Design a protein around this ligand. Structure first.
Ligand SMILES: Nc1ncnc2c1ncn2[C@@H]1O[C@H](COP(=O)(O)OP(=O)(O)OP(=O)(O)O)[C@@H](O)[C@H]1O
Ligand SMILES: Nc1ncnc2c1ncn2[C@@H]1O[C@H](COP(=O)(O)OP(=O)(O)OP(=O)(O)O)[C@@H](O)[C@H]1O
Ligand SMILES: [Ca+2]
Ligand SMILES: [Zn+2]
Ligand SMILES: [Zn+2]
Lengths: 744, 146, 48, 49
């Protein structure tokens, strides 16, 4: 609001804040003495947060040189006897936490039992050049010598209260430093503020946005410790690779990054379900047992999946030492048995290993039910909710009546527990609000089920009823339609069916007609390079299958020509007692040209008897030459040439993605060459302005933060996120093209 | 130096110098460097050859034992698939390094049951191991050299 | 080569206006700028 | 990195390099933070006094 902001610029508020800034710094250092006034210190620092956020809101929407930031630095330099010392309290208190436990000085002979006296660190700090002047004496004075007649108590309590204000003042100085350069009075302060500033470097994310002014402006925020650690886990790290490959490889520009917001949206679900499982620090007592057991599966799912390889390779090593004999050891008397090299442990070992392999496979499928099934259900639930809210896929227009996905989704609409895993439990009530007046709302209640649709007006408005629970409620408190829908989608995806395929040969493997080895082939998909090979065959399935058909027909013409004319030549020797002419029948001849024919160098002519100048000599020699000229050296080379080229293409696509990312900004459309006009310009640019994680962190605390506490720019983003309009992203400018003439 | 000092023994091992001395040529050096340029992918692919052939050996051991028999004037105990080690090595030596796949060396199925089951075995073997997968092994480092 | 020519035609149409000589990158400076542009201004049927 | 640890204690470390003063430069730089005597232990510094 330019009016209110401009009015406050010319008011007496500058005088007020400088008075506050002077008085705040004095009593807080006075109040730190003896720790009696810590409650008041909490209140003062808590109010200082409210002071700084007022200043930040004043700074919102400014020009690079708007004269409000200029007035702000004029206020600040007028407080030059005060803005330094307020920073120095944080400087000392951060630095001592760094210094303690990071040198030779420790507990040592003062008190190993954690009851150190006053002289524990009297002038150990004096060796360091960090503290000088009366500051070291001030720390000694502020050293609460309680029970003089501690490292773990002195520095400990001054971390929780001072966190927020230190981050906020760091934000203010950082934003001011970027907004108005060529202000050397401001440049003095950042040397003093360097320690606290670099401490909050991991927890100061930075975002560029656009909208409402056709201008780029920065945003600053806090990040939780746990979420920063959670994103760095290997599972989410892998999922980043899987998403980022697809959208850059084939996604269009318009649909480039609705998928990206969707990826962020369900990526939140990944940390949530991962946050439930943890290393956490009698019917009633059974629940804790099953919860601990299933969570133990959920953490180490990939590890036991790798264990299946060791079981498979080890059992298949024992599969070699076999023999057969005319009789059992001591005419339809085959006997399969071992040939162990003078050691009897192998035969018991095979039974033991088989039992273990079956068990660990069952562990894989149970853990996969716990872990990834929530995510795929989340995807389908989100698809139905967004499509119903913003479109008429089941109310305005039916589907195409060919896609099974749309038809199978029809059943869950009537159920009451439809948005089980999705966040919002109100989409059913939103669609009737939108498409209520056009269509019959009662019919719409029929489409959604809407159990007690009349009660939906006052389901939880008139009162909040709550009848009690009971035992064995699970046997009659489950929606059968919803569960059937769940099982259908769970069986539809490829990944779960692969585990079931593993299970069928695993259970059948205890029969052990050598079929343990079938696991060993397709288990090796986990290698990326090997997986590309198997994917290459189906990459050109249509073209390949048509080409194999043309092989099947072009050879068939040669067979009928041979059947008419060249019957006498095809004769395998039997010492002149040969009824083995293999072209007295079309099925025999056609199969002969497959087995003995194409899979042989030189074509047919190698195997058939030589034409010894016995009529049709030229007619025969052209037959073999034209056969070899068409089927083998040309057409079979097409069959070879298709997928090998495809394999090269797929490898080139992967390398293309990796090269394309480095040479072009992902979010912003600007190429890397513009940012290559500075040392580390592109690297710093993609590090901070478009980090690709800070945006994901941006969407999180917006969900976590209360609606009343949203700032101006924060609420500006959140409104469009509800409305699903992806315009506020920059898409052409990155705070530098706007201000290229003045300065970055 | 080691082969040089050992060469005074002179069990023909002077010739080992002659191979790797020719690295000084640039064009020749590129050839030797090309093999290790894609070592990871090559080694994984050779592993897939080793396993995809192993499935064919166990299928043959169950069903097609009678066919594998080298002639000894009807005094032949030389059935080379009465033992998995023998059969698996047979598919390496006599098998992959031969045009047309396995079917050239084995006795012809003379309409003696499992005819379609046998003809598909040799065709699918030749269709996967030789004309495709071995061509991948050839195609990797030649592309790397380019 | 022939397969590459067919794919070349399909890729060349998307990255360049057919009737007008202007490349698609100029109309890519708006959401759906090229798509709306080729939808209405040069539809290839409306001329017929 | 592990194999390079041994040469630090030796006196004739910069035998072939030009500068024979890097041992004296690092203690000037990182002297006040860490214990300079411990730094003499890291570099050897025969007769550090
Ligand atoms: N917003 C972005 N704009 C442009 N490039 C980006 C963006 N985010 C990431 N990148 C690029 O993606 C890659 C980042 O990789 P990632 O964050 O996965 O780190 P890593 O696991 O250490 O691996 P690597 O950097 O080798 O890919 C770098 O090429 C970086 O330039
Ligand atoms: N005047 C034009 N200028 C530029 N591109 C055009 C023009 N007319 C058509 N195109 C492009 O040609 C294609 C139009 O295809 P067509 O009208 O045959 O529709 P379709 O049968 O649904 O198939 P498809 O869009 O997949 O080719 C799109 O790539 C469109 O961008
Ligand atoms: Ca508010
Ligand atoms: Zn960017
Ligand atoms: Zn046009």
């Amino acid at each position: 609001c330019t009016g209110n902001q401009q009015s406050l610029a010319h008011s007496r508020l500058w005088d007020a804040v400088v008075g506050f800034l002077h008085v705040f710094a004095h009593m807080m250092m006075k109040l730190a003495q003896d720790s009696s006034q810590i409650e008041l210190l909490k209140e003062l620092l808590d109010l200082q947060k409210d002071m700084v956020v007022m200043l930040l809101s004043l700074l919102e929407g400014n020009v690079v040189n708007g004269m409000i930031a200029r007035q702000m630095v004029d206020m600040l330099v007028e407080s030059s006897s005060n803005v330094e010392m307020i920073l120095k309290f944080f400087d000392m208190f951060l630095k001592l936490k760094d210094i303690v436990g990071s040198e030779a000085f420790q507990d040592y002979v003062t008190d190993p039992r954690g009851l150190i006296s006053k002289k524990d660190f009297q002038k150990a700090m004096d060796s360091q050049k960090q503290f000088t002047g009366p500051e070291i004496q001030f720390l000694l004075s502020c050293s609460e010598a309680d029970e003089n007649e501690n490292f773990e108590e002195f520095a400990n309590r001054f971390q929780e209260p001072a966190r927020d204000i230190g981050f906020n003042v760091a934000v203010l100085l950082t934003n001011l430093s970027e907004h108005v350069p060529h202000d050397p009075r401001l440049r003095n302060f950042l040397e003093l503020a360097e320690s606290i500033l670099e401490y909050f470097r991991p927890y100061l994310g930075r975002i560029e946005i656009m909208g409402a002014s056709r201008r780029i402006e920065r945003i600053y925020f806090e990040i939780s410790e746990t979420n920063r650690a959670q994103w760095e886990m290997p599972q989410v790290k892998e999922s980043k690779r899987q998403f980022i490959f697809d959208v850059v490889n084939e996604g269009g520009e318009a649909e480039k990054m609705e998928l990206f917001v969707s990826f962020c949206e369900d990526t939140i679900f990944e940390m949530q379900i991962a946050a439930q499982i943890s290393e956490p620090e009698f019917w009633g007592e059974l629940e804790v047992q099953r919860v601990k057991f299933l969570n133990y599966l959920s953490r180490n799912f990939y590890t036991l999946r790798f264990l299946a390889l060791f079981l498979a390779f080890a059992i298949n090593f024992i599969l070699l030492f076999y023999k057969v004999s005319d009789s059992p050891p001591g005419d339809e008397n085959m006997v399969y048995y071992f040939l162990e090299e003078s050691t009897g442990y192998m035969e018991p070992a095979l039974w033991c290993l088989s039992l273990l392999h079956t068990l660990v496979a069952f562990l894989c499928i149970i853990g996969y039910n716990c872990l990834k099934v929530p995510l795929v259900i989340f995807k389908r639930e989100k698809e139905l909710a967004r499509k119903l809210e913003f479109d008429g896929l089941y109310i305005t227009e039916q589907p195409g009546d060919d896609d099974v996905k749309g038809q199978w989704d029809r059943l869950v609409l009537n159920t009451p527990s439809f948005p089980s895993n999705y966040w919002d439990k109100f989409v059913k009530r939103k669609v009737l609000d939108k498409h209520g007046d056009i269509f019959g709302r009662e019919r719409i209640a029929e489409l959604l089920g809407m159990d007690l649709a009349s009660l939906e007006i006052t389901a939880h408005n008139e009162r909040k009823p709550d009848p009690p629970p009971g035992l064995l409620t699970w046997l009659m408190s489950i929606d059968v339609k919803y569960q059937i829908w769940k099982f259908g989608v769970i069986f539809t995806d490829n990944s779960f069916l692969y585990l079931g395929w593993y299970m069928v040969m695993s259970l059948l493997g205890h029969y052990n007609n050598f079929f343990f080895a079938a696991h060993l082939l397709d288990i090796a998909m986990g290698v990326k390079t090997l997986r590309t090979i198997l994917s290459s065959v189906t990459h050109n399935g249509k073209q390949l299958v048509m080409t194999v058909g043309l092989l099947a027909v072009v050879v068939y013409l040669y067979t009928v020509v041979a059947f008419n004319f060249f019957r006498k030549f095809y004769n395998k020797s039997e010492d002149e007692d040969e009824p083995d002419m293999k072209c007295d029948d079309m099925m025999t001849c056609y199969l002969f040209h497959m087995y003995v024919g194409v899979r042989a160098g030189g074509g047919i002519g190698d195997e058939i008897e030589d034409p010894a100048g016995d009529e049709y000599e030229l007619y025969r020699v052209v037959f073999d030459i034209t056969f070899f000229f068409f089927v083998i050296v040309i057409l079979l080379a097409i069959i070879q040439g298709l997928i090998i080229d495809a394999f090269g293409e797929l490898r080139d696509q992967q390398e293309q993605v990796k090269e394309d990312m480095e040479t072009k900004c992902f979010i912003c459309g600007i190429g890397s060459d513009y940012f290559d006009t500075t040392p580390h310009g592109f690297e710093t640019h993609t590090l901070e302005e478009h980090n690709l994680a800070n945006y994901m962190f941006f969407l999180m605390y917006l969900i976590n933060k209360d609606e009343t506490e949203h700032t101006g720019q924060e609420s500006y983003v959140w409104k469009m996120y509800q409305e699903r309009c992806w315009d506020f992203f920059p898409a052409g400018d990155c705070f530098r093209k706007q201000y290229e003439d003045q300065l970055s």
